[PDB]
């Protein structure tokens, strides 16, 4: 048993809810929250900027030190950093950004990072400003992630479409 509430079960291991991932993280304080990161860990908009804003910019300060030491992530890659006031850990995962021309086949590699963690709160990857089709992202998630993932979908209209079209 875990603390996640109000989710619709899609599969053995994937759950979904219409929720603001920031508000969900603040309530649950999960072991792992996933950030929809870019390779520079520049948390400017969407989930990364909202997560970073909710940490009072501490996520960005930590991230800048990580990049100064290690250089950029790979598209499809990840790093584990602090969860600050939102979670124990934040798993920063880089899905391909369609609006920058990245290979959508890298979306499966991105979701494979989730399998290193038993339970995660996470948004769909490559959605919103990354330019991928969220229906596709949910299908790759279900077909790739084997650990228990709790998906927060901000947009109520999209949530309803994801559920009603789910195979
Ligand atoms: N890639 S993003 O611009 O941060 C993004 C991620 C998820 C949602 C959503 O749940 O609706 C919206 C935008």
Curated annotation (Swiss-Prot):
Changing residue 31 to A: In strain: Mu/B.1.621. Inhibited in vitro by GRL-0617. It is a multi-pass membrane protein. Residues 1-167 form the Macro domain. It comes from the Viruses. It is found in: Host endoplasmic reticulum membrane. It catalyses: Thiol-dependent hydrolysis of ester, thioester, amide, peptide and isopeptide bonds formed by the C-terminal Gly of ubiquitin (a 76-residue protein attached to proteins as an intracellular targeting signal). Responsible for the cleavages located at the N-terminus of the replicase polyprotein. Participates together with nsp4 in the assembly of virally-induced cytoplasmic double-membrane vesicles necessary for viral replication. Antagonizes innate immune induction of type I interferon by blocking the phosphorylation, dimerization and subsequent nuclear translocation of host IRF3. Also prevents host NF-kappa-B signaling. In addition, PL-PRO possesses a deubiquitinating/deISGylating activity and processes both 'Lys-48'- and 'Lys-63'-linked polyubiquitin chains from cellular substrates. May form homohexamers. Interacts with N protein. This is Papain-like protease nsp3. The lineage of its organism: Viruses, Riboviria, Orthornavirae, Pisuviricota, Pisoniviricetes. The chain holds residues 1025 to 1191 of 7096 of the full protein.
